[PDB]
Amino acid sequence: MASNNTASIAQARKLVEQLKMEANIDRIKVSKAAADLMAYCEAHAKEDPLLTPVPASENPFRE
Amino acid sequence: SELDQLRQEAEQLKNQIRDARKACADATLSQITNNIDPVGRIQMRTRRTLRGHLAKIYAMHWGTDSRLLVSASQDGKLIIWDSYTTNKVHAIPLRSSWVMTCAYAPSGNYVACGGLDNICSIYNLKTREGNVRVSRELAGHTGYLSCCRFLDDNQIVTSSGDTTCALWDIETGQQTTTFTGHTGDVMSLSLAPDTRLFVSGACDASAKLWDVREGMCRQTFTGHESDINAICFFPNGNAFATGSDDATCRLFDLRADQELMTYSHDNIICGITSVSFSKSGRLLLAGYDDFNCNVWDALKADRAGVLAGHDNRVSCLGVTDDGMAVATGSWDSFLKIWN
Amino acid sequence: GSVSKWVRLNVGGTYFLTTRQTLCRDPKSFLYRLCQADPDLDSDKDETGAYLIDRDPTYFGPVLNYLRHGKLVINKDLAEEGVLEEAEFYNITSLIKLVKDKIRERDSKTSQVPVKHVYRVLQCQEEELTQMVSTMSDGWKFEQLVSIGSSYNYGNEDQAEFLCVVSKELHNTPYGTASEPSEKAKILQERGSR
Amino acid sequence: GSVSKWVRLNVGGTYFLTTRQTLCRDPKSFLYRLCQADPDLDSDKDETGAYLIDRDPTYFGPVLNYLRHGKLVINKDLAEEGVLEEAEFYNITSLIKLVKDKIRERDSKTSQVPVKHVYRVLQCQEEELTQMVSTMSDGWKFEQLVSIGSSYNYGNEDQAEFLCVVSKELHNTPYGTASEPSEKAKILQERGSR
Amino acid sequence: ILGLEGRSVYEEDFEAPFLEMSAEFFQMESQKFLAENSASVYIKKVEARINEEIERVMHCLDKSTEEPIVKVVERELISKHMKTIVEMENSGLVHMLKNGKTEDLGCMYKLFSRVPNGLKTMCECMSSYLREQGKALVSEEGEGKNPVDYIQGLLDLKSRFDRFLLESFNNDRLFKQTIAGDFEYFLNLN
């Protein structure tokens, strides 16, 4: 509806909904989320071969 | 009138969201915990240069098989490579040139491409005939097909032009559901390993995480300062790395529901044109509008290494699903298999 | 007297009995507006209760074909342009779309007389050559193969050894010889140009 | 409508006067209703009384001829695709197969209109080159020869002497019946892909 | 529609004049009603007229016009002549709670629930009522008072006042807070 600036109020309703779910969605502090990411990354560091030397036949790109 | 009142209401809602994030905002433990083992500088050498292209490479996408990359050149050419031997499994001319996006399906045999054609071209790699006969030509798009990613064998997301990031049923060639709400064009998409939540990065600098199982948005990450080039989910899908035409990368966490941590860079100022995660997701590889790209630590926010050896900008990145290497859809017409 | 569930319409000299539903392909169409009586209409054939409108039935042919059948197929001997003129007079954007698609199909079919024809270039190695010509995409015709010098790996068997050139009669444009541009596409084209 | 041994159909406003018996060939087609003079299909016209069918007379021709004398004759000035659509409307499977065969013959003959077109490359040196150029198959058309760098001497009498790209205008089969893969075929395709 | 892209015509020609004259009509009607009516009569008549005005405005006004009109309605009727309706002669919260008429208490509360000003004024009112009841209870009544009615009689007073509150002014956090505060206040009087 144009005379309401092309129903820009629908964006307001969507933002109401966005606040609703963002509040419903739990808020995880930055420090502990970072801790979880450290745990996953360091636990996966050895199997990330980018972090490790690769022999001339281990990769399928020197085969 | 009261339209301005509803706009105010939206403003105060965003203010509340900012307040909730700020309360959720804590000290980033990863950067202060910089006593983690140093990332150093990884001297990175490509074992296989993919000179099969002779035009610029705009998009590229490894497959679920994690051996075939579908690097698309804007001249209307798809090169389904053999990354392990530098052989062209397929070389497909495209009905229209200036293709900017190419994705490889969970089928492992379907490939998608989007140009200025406004028609999403899905090519069946394997048929009874043995040649790459096109599977489907999904029309109905309004703007240019800014980015495309395969949801399923018959479901796909096409962040098209005209603020469109709709879902499409490949078999019917029609939209499955309509995803809309952005005021800017949608040109960035990201695939979570969940494969059920896609964060679309539009030109209004709004990383809207949409849920594919509903016809409505899930989260709306912001903090961007320019249109979002590429978005890469973590190998857990718990957070995504975001790059826009700014001099800093960003990392938005869904559990925090806020920008978890930003990768400030003043040693390089070129816009972040592509973002990626390593096998662990510890290494965040950033493609840059200059020839040489980089890889920074997602933990200590420092450069793990430099992707050097290029002669023109890299327009897309793709890491091995085994983490053996990364292919760089550069503009020097060679994809460099950086092992 | 002149209107029923069906309606008699005098396109050209001939009179077709067609349902009021079938004649309308969008409520902006002039035909639908003519289906119900209007105070503006003065000249009509009240001899048989059929409204008089002045257009050729030959280009009404494909129009009514699409309206009744839901799919537009314009005969290879009849002007798709005449169908488009019929649609534009009757103000049916759907028919505008199909005539557009048919005209693209015809321009593919007439891609010998001047109208855009897609051409593409592919690289191939000596070994890959047989595969990618053999696995060359359906709907494309091979046009040329050129041998080149080998900058790597001796003089033959090079990843850049042969340039294949293929083509497609259908043009790459979204429609005909002119498509409505977009500004961001030009922005990115300038970005890639330099 | 009016009772007669024949029946007058208003096919697109055009009166088809055809006998009722030739329309009893396919009850599984819409026509066999239109032939009922009893109240199974009742249709009239406020000018003649003809029954009304909202199907085109454009592609009604070949289908009606197939009903009359058992064989379709698609006029080579009308779209065989339109005849296939008309066959679909009366969903005569034999007629569907016949029009699809006509479209396949078209696509083989019009392989340069973007439809199926098969290509290959032979490898030969001059001695065998003359032989297999001379003994080229009927249907396969030579499209290009090319030399390949010869490590022996500088030119001829090397096994790697000439590639011979040849082509054939191949029929495109309307989809839904062709190009249907198989599981073990895909297993072997994956085996041979590497 | 003549607003075209903005609300300018709709906002200007009638929206604001309707709002302002609506405030004035509400003011004068509420003044006349308070002059002419007791507590319950004022409640019934003002609520009936509020429903009438809202009915007409929904028919004649847009959705976006609701936010101002509701505030004006709650401000000019149920926010200015309110403090009188709390307590008078022959009526009032303290007078009426002893009369045991639950239905009027409910309405006196549900009408007042739209404005937090009315709710807090009632909270003060029956807080004073409960404090008076507790102070009368802790002192001996008649010829002596049993410890059942004095120390643990606070519990009986709390239970009966909880019944009153739940049946008249429903379960609301502010009312529970004030009744618990009163219960703790004369708890020291045992």
Full strand arrangement of the beta sheet holding B239-244: B228-233, B239-244, B248-253, B258-264
First-to-last C-alpha distance (Å) of chain B = 61
Kindly report the length of chain B.
339
CB pair distance less than 8 Å for C73 and D52:
no
Experimental method: cryo-EM
Rounded Cα distance, E16 and D190, in Å: 75
Encoded tokens for E121: 């004024």
Encoded tokens for B169: 């049923």
Farthest CA pair distance, chain D: 90
* Cβ count near D109 (within 10 Å): 12
Residue of D nearest to C13 (CA): D13
Q: What is the DSSP string of chain D?
A: ----SEEEEEETTEEEEEETTGGGS-TTSTHHHHT--STTS----SSS--EEE-S-STTHHHHHHHHHHSS----TTS-HHHHHHHHHHTT-HHHHHHHHHHHHHHHHHTTTTTS--EEEEEEE-HHHHHHHHHT--SSEEEEEEEE---SSSSSSSSSS-EEEEEEE--PPPPTTSS----HHHHHHHHHHH-
Q: At a CB cut-off of 8 Å and minimum separation 6, what does B285 contact?
A: B275, B276, B277, B278, B293, B294, B295, B307, B317, B319, B326
Entry resolution (Å): 4.0
Given a contact cutoff of 8 angstroms between Cβ atoms, the answer to whether B151 and B212 are in contact is: yes
D46, D148, D172: residue with CB nearest C126: D148
Q: At a CB cut-off of 8 Å and minimum separation 6, what does E17 contact?
A: none
Residue of E nearest to B2 (CA): E64
Facing residues of D124 across strands? D162
| B to D CB pairs, distance under 8 Å | 15
The letter for the amino acid at C135 is T
State the burial class of residue B247 (Cβ atoms within 10 Å of its Cβ: 0-12, 13-18, 19+): middle
Given a contact cutoff of 8 angstroms between Cβ atoms, the answer to whether B47 and B329 are in contact is: no
Kindly report the length of chain C.
194
Encoded tokens for E1: 């529609």
- B126 reaches D (C-beta below 8 A): yes
CB pair distance less than 8 Å for B126 and D181:
yes
* Cβ count near B337 (within 10 Å): 26
> Residues D173, D178, D179, D185: what is their CA dihedral angle, to the nearest 10 degrees?
-140
Encoded tokens for C135: 């696995």
Residue A56 three-state SS: coil
Full strand arrangement of the beta sheet holding B87-93: B57-59, B72-73, B77-82, B87-93
CB pair distance less than 8 Å for B53 and C123:
yes
Angle C11-C14-C20 (CA atoms, 0-180°, nearest 5)?
Answer: 55
Q: Round the CA-based radius of gyration of chain B to a whole number and report it.
A: 20
Closest-CA distance, D169 to chain B, in angstroms, reads: 15
Beta strands B77-82 and B72-73, pairing class: antiparallel
CB pair distance less than 8 Å for C174 and B117:
yes
Q: In Å, how far from its chain's centre is CA B18?
A: 26
Closest-CA distance, C76 to chain D, in angstroms, reads: 6
Picking from D115, D186, D187, D191 by the largest number of B CB atoms within 10 A of its own CB, the best residue to mutate is: D186
Rounded Cα distance, B207 and B187, in Å: 11
Given a contact cutoff of 8 angstroms between Cβ atoms, the answer to whether D66 and D95 are in contact is: yes
So what's the architecture of A4-63 in CATH?
Answer: Irregular (4.10)
User: Which residues in chain B have Cβ-Cβ distances shorter than 8 Å to A6?
Assistant: none
Domains of chain A by residue range: 4-63
Facing residues of D167 across strands? D119, D141
Its sign, for the CA torsion B254, B259, B264, B268, is positive
Picking from B128, B131, B132 by the largest number of D CB atoms within 10 A of its own CB, the best residue to mutate is: B128
* Of the options 2.130.10.10, 3.10.20.600, 1.10.760.10, 3.10.50.40, the CATH number for the domain spanning B1-339: 2.130.10.10
Angle B144-C178-C26 (CA atoms, 0-180°, nearest 5)?
Answer: 75
